[model samples]
Target: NLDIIGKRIEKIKQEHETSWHYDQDHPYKTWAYHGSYETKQTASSMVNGVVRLLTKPWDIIPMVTQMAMTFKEKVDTRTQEPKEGTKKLMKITAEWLWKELGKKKTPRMCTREEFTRKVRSNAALGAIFNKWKSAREAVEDSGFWELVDKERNLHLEGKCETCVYNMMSRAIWYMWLGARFLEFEALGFLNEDHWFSRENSLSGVEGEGLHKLGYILRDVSKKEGGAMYADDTAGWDTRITLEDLKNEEMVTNHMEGEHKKLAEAIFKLTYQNKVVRVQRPTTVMDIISRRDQRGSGQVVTYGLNTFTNMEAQLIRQMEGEGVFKSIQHLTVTEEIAVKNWLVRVGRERLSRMAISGDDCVVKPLDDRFASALTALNDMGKVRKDIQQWEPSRGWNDWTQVPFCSHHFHELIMKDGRVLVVPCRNQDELIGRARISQGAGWSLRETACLGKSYAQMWSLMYFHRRDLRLAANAICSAVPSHWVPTSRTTATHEWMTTEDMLTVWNRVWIQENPWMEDKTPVESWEEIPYLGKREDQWCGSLIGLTSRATWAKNIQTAINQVRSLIGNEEYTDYMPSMKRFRR
Candidate 1:
């Protein structure tokens, strides 16, 4: 009976595996196509149209005016056609937004069904709608829009930096809104807003929040005149509470002298709720933690270090084809700025991490501790499994963990010296911003999509009043957030670790909130112990702690044993040939 049942289960499993899923290929009829499919196509079309209009004005202007004639309004004996589509487009958007605002002020808010039915009821108008929050908020915030109106004169007379920057940023927002709405519809919702921003208020900072943190770190480190160390419990700007530590029910007997001394300071500080000068990391652990701070473990190759030779040639090829002839200056300026920033920021942060205990693969500046290099290289080879573990449908493996701006990769020299290099090769900046290749590629895409610095400034200079009111009214009724459609899913790749000590640092930060935390313990003796008793802190003579750290430590110890045997070549254990011969 058991054998028969097993066969039946196998048969059912095979049947389910082979069955057709929702994403199967089919013709796209308007009625049959999903909302996401329609929105995605619409966004692409709109982006393409705008880009062509700006880049190929000679070809487009005549075609545009010809089409405008079709929307002619009667004035006496003649039909008058609008010169450009901007007025008509914004007017329609304004009407939709105004309608949404009126709905908001009604006796009660409309249900999702009622709202969708009304907004999506029109043949022409329904095609433009999607659920994004920016447009909705833009309309509701009358104060900001009115302020924008008042500031117009200042901007026109002389370029007001705030007004200009806001206009540039706002224009940038539209490109993101259009592109992301498509991605949201097709690929599902992105948790782009997850990473913590220690600097920004509760409202969060503009642009990619994690990307902004790197600039923050660079500036803070420079201002402080040295590498900064953040206490685990208090972070840079925050204070620890007595209640936070009291519940831990901590004891000190098991801790070593230095460890014990640190804990005493931590406990004492927490009682007073003193804000320390240390800064807190925004995204510490990539895969294991339940922190909402997690984003797509993948980033694009927009930074200089990651930009490929192929991408460079591709940009040149596009330029030769007259793809970016009109915006030549914009393209050049953007490339120089991004590459320069990446080089400087990369160097500054790496220098600080090298001095700090965070990076193990970085070469020691002092020759006296030169022996540490040998140990470091040996550890890198032995702990091959310490790489990231990407979670997918089933299989697990770590390729590389994507960082905010760049990732540190261990490059072993031919002479056996391990040098830590900041890498952005093939890594993407995908989460918060739209998909971008590099500076040149990004600039070309923006120009092609009808974006230019000149236009961005001019919009504010000329049509500030009309633009503000229109944007506010239109954005308010749009969907507040992008969510994943039924057929779409997300993938997160895990990052590889350069050394065991780096892994240990991540584990330490995740597990404990102890003060005076110096990571990547310099020596085995310096490694801290945890738990109620000394034995439990390290591990008992026979068994291990039934927890996460014990398993990680066991793996580390296995690599250490491998290093001792000088068997760093293989990922799995290989018994020593010398021992067998003996």
Candidate 2:
């Protein structure tokens, strides 16, 4: 049954995928034709004669059907033959006739009934008759005939050809009337004084309402001026040419000059002398939290690093583009300025990272530690009391100063015979020895083995604590005060050694379930109790590392994964190897 159903579903899907094709060979006949009268002179003469005879614009002038019928009747009466192109033209005309008669007759021969039907249904013929009738009515309605007589007399007195003078007079009169009407409309005075009187309070109300009428009238005047000067004429040509030169500076400046003036005018009209102020509680914390959650995570990373590099690049590009004059001329906040300087140095580090590529393959542990150390060095050098001397000149001046911590001392001592460790806790044993010995002390000069050993033990203990704190912070248990109060509880819970182990155990089983049969303590431990404790610590560290790594990796994977899988149904895991390829 399942197989049968699947086959049916496949058939349906195939049917749905089918598409229709249209063939262009099918005939599509149309009745429209294009032809020009012999000359403007002849056409105008004929039009004038028709206008005089009809006495109205809508009186029937002539149509192709009437002309054809008349020609046929005259030919039949005289028993005359048709001319050269007459047969082909007749054949074309006959096809239209047959189509109009619902294709019931042949194109070459149509009956009287068919001819009558075609003529009666012809919209083109009706439109010609209506226009002639309208023109005739217009001629008879007013003293237009007397006006034409007066114009004819004036043309003769001026020694003008009647045809040319008549055409020019009509065109000039039309242009004059059009200009007047436009002026009336622009000024919101389309109607005469009868309807739009100025005696009553609302007599001149030009629209549906008084306030809207005034606003629309004002807006129309302003809009019409701009449109007339901009779209219809060449008024903007000079302004735009000047604007092009100004726009070479900044695109916004071109708009700002004009728009800002207009905006200020509107602002003064609406807001002047209408001031009210109110105080509200500061919501900076809420704003910051929301911003942190909703902002682009990449933007946050850029805020930490990327944007700084981009800003430096931007400054350099701007300078190259001839916009920047000097470093002092660049306007930026102190924080951003410092960040840009750091980015200059960081770019070298990034270049090294790219060349080696070890930073990409190895975990980010060492990279993060190095970043923290660099930050500490920067902080100490910038401190007022530190009084660190700056190099005379060159990029080497920004070289990082080695930290005075015990971890740094260990690295230095292993490589060199002279060991100089700066201690913060001066009252303690190590601090006292450093104070007593002064500067330039070799390791052999320290004869007090007991104090040296005790100081080493203390240093080791503190180093372990520092490492744990650093690991926890990186793993997401940054102290309660460091993160928002809402996340403090969750962070604290996950920071526990037991919870971290549990997470690690689950992850290990999921990834390598074959080893699940073996006990975690017995199989993994090397020295029973102590090994077990260390194993627990290792589990927490692994869990912390994995969670942080996966958070970034999985999000990126899922985004790419969704693009491949789309919304299709599947039973197997989607392949991800293709996504990793360039």
Candidate 3:
């Protein structure tokens, strides 16, 4: 189910001003990992090895379904209709891309026997994969950028900026598919958020295709100087897209007057410099969405007002490690920027749904595809269930039909305002690139171990690649697109990105303290302690406190824990141990 979302995003990419360029010897080729498991410094025993999350089958289905279904709703413009183009041309593009990218052999734990028995052999899934030309083709197409250009011109000739913005977002979404799925897989067959560029050290702007779209951004607002100001996001050069400005501003005139009109029926919340001088917390989503085009976190005085309390809650979730300061003022440019961002957040709601729905619950394989498909079925009830659903109710809130378990959480406050929370948080979602890579890698996995984490996310992102950028693998006959370069290895040690994040944040690092750099007193080394041959065992560590509070609390804090466990038994002289340095 997550797979179908592919082709739709693909056509969008092909129609971009710059489609994904296929250069075999580019520097991204240089970014690949050795294999799923990197050899430890001391050989195989102690590994800085990757624990691939691809093996989790139970968890895979939900993610797969939710990902695909997210794009199920119509992409509304003023028309209130759905418009599509060629399935054949899209197929042609998909085939060309596959020739360039797929058909490669890569690392996986599953044997071909299992793939044939489970997924590749599934009559239902196989039928759709063949009919739709698969999740890959569904999401990608070469030379398709021209198609989008033609459509844009048509819309422009008609003066439909709403469709233009919709096209802009789709185009960006398409580019993201390449960046996330294929290109990152080229780096390594990683499905984690790491596959998408979080913070690129250098080559980000120049190397990636999406960075080329910044030039078309002129002020469409017709406000002050009327579209004359150019974006200086690079502070000197151009940014990725006109939509790429870090901090955003106005123009609800065209936006609200178009498809998102009903959203204006509610109050848009923003902090003001009114009778009360205000400073409330903002989430990283708030920061990134509202920052200057360059990723600069500027102080937001007042701009796009969040209509729902859940909207405010979402923009202020777990993102507070407290590095960013509260915003102050909105530039005249920011009015349209935030307005456009609000519009984006509207459509973006469809893409950010969670598989587990609200309570992080799952129905199990006994339901077969029913667990997922049924939930998808419920998506049909949206317009019916909530008659006046709009962005004012929160993005996913309006169209959320409680499909399967993937529904939203709506809480009414004392003031009778609605606080809407989707099954998954939008802030937690990644780019199209990540989703594409996720599905693609899952397909490659289906060839072997029979699954990827998305197959498991039916079970899902923080990190999978920093430690390992696994690409190449040697099977009986390798699938070319799955690997970077290859030799002749049989079974690859596939690691699931899913387990790594959850296991460690809650368990592994707790048991094996040395592997965690956050530990106060080190035994032998850091938390990356790999299992090895001769000098095998890495000594354990004592955390007692988190990385942040460790140093500050040792004097008084240590006394309490030690006294509770008994000072004599707990601290055989703990002070000197804490004094040990890097």
Pick the lDDT winner: 1
TM-score of each: 0.17, 0.16, 0.20
lDDT of each: 0.23, 0.21, 0.21
The alpha-carbon lDDT assigned to residue 466 of candidate 1 equals 18
TM-score of 3: 0.20
> Model 1, which residues run further than 4 Å from truth?
1-195, 200-218, 225-582
Q: Per-residue alpha-carbon lDDT of model 1 for 151-219, expressed as tens digits?
A: 333223322212100001001111222222221221111122221112211111223322133333333
Alpha carbon lDDT at 182, candidate 2: 19
The window of 10 residues in a row where model 1 has the poorest summed lDDT is 163-172
Candidate 3 Cα errors over 4 Å, as ranges: 1-143, 157-582
Best by TM-score: 3
Q: What is candidate 2's lDDT per residue for 294-337, written digit by digit as tens?
A: 01111111111221222222222222233323332233453354
The TM-score that candidate 2 achieves is 0.16
Error of 2 at 241 (Å): 36
Instruction: State the lDDT of candidate 3 residue by residue for 1-582, as single tens digits.
Output: 112222323443344425233333322221121111111110011101011221111123343234423410122111111111111112222232223222232222222233233323221111112123543443344443344344334333322111110111111111221111211221122112111111211101112111111110110111121111110111110111122111112112223222222111111111100010011121000000110111110101001111111121122210121111222333445434433443444223211211111111111112121112111111121122323222112221222333222333333323332223223332122111123322223333433332232222211111111111111111111222232211111011123423223433332233332233333323311222112221111111122233224334333443432333232322122222223232
* Root-mean-square deviation per candidate: 33.4, 43.8, 25.6
